[PDB]
């Protein structure tokens, strides 16, 4: 099929990309924007982004 099953980072794993900001795909949760289980995600593998620190 060709879909990749992404998850959140854990102990001892190699990161792949950074999720980005979209007003349509994301769903608001905990007073913030978030991606839920299922559905599609936007992960950027190249470019410049503002990460949480």
């Amino acid at each position: 099929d060709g879909h990749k099953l992404v998850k959140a980072l854990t102990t001892g794993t190699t990161p792949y990309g950074v999720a980005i900001r979209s007003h349509w795909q994301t769903v608001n949760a905990q007073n913030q924007m978030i991606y839920e289980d299922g559905g599609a995600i936007n992960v950027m593998t190249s470019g410049r982004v503002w990460m949480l620190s």
Binding site: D1, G2, H3, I20, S22, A40, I41, N42
Partner: peptide, 10 residues
């Protein structure tokens, strides 16, 4: 050919 389920910024 083939097709897949995509997102907004793809």
């Amino acid at each position: 050919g083939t097709a897949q389920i995509i997102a907004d910024y793809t």
